[PDB]
Amino acid sequence: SEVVVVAKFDYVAQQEQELDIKKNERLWLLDDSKSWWRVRNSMNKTGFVPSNYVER
Amino acid sequence: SEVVVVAKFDYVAQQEQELDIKKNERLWLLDDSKSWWRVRNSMNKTGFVPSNYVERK
């Protein structure tokens, strides 16, 4: 579900896929049912997948 | 911390920033301390931020 969220802290993005935000900024959370991990595969391609799709 | 994870399910990436994976594939989880939400700002730029950095409004 799409909901509005508020930044608790500043965040300086470390990669182009990330977003710079400031404390108290309001953002659209596009899908509150989705959390993501950044993973890298055996072919050295990197990207995001849903957290519940992988496990230790 | 970096750990190796196993895909529980196939996943077809929906955007260029996501990764296609197959069930039972082993992957590097680059930092298991980071769990990300995809958000969009007032300037209509979209990207990932760590989930503990935002909450409902």
UniProtKB/Swiss-Prot annotation, chain B:
It is found in: Cytoplasm; Endoplasmic reticulum; Nucleus. Coiled coil: none annotated. Phosphorylated on Ser and Tyr residues. Phosphorylated in response to activation of EGFR and FcERI. Phosphorylated by activated PDGFRB. Residues 2-57 form the SH3 domain. Only the first and third SH3 domains seem to be involved in RASA1-binding; the second SH3 domain and the SH2 domains do not seem to be involved. Interacts (via SH2 domain and SH3 domain 2) with EGFR. Interacts with PAK1 and SOS1. Interacts (via SH3 domains) with PKN2. Associates with BLNK, PLCG1, VAV1 and NCK1 in a B-cell antigen receptor-dependent fashion. Interacts with SOCS7. This interaction is required for nuclear import. Part of a complex containing PPP1R15B, PP1 and NCK1. Interacts with RALGPS1. Interacts with CAV2 (tyrosine phosphorylated form). Interacts with ADAM15. Interacts with FASLG. Directly interacts with RASA1. Interacts with isoform 4 of MINK1. Interacts with FLT1 (tyrosine phosphorylated). Adapter protein which associates with tyrosine-phosphorylated growth factor receptors, such as KDR and PDGFRB, or their cellular substrates. Maintains low levels of EIF2S1 phosphorylation by promoting its dephosphorylation by PP1. Plays a role in the DNA damage response, not in the detection of the damage by ATM/ATR, but for efficient activation of downstream effectors, such as that of CHEK2. Plays a role in ELK1-dependent transcriptional activation in response to activated Ras signaling. Modulates the activation of EIF2AK2/PKR by dsRNA. This is SH2/SH3 adapter protein NCK1. It comes from Homo sapiens (Human). The gene is NCK1.
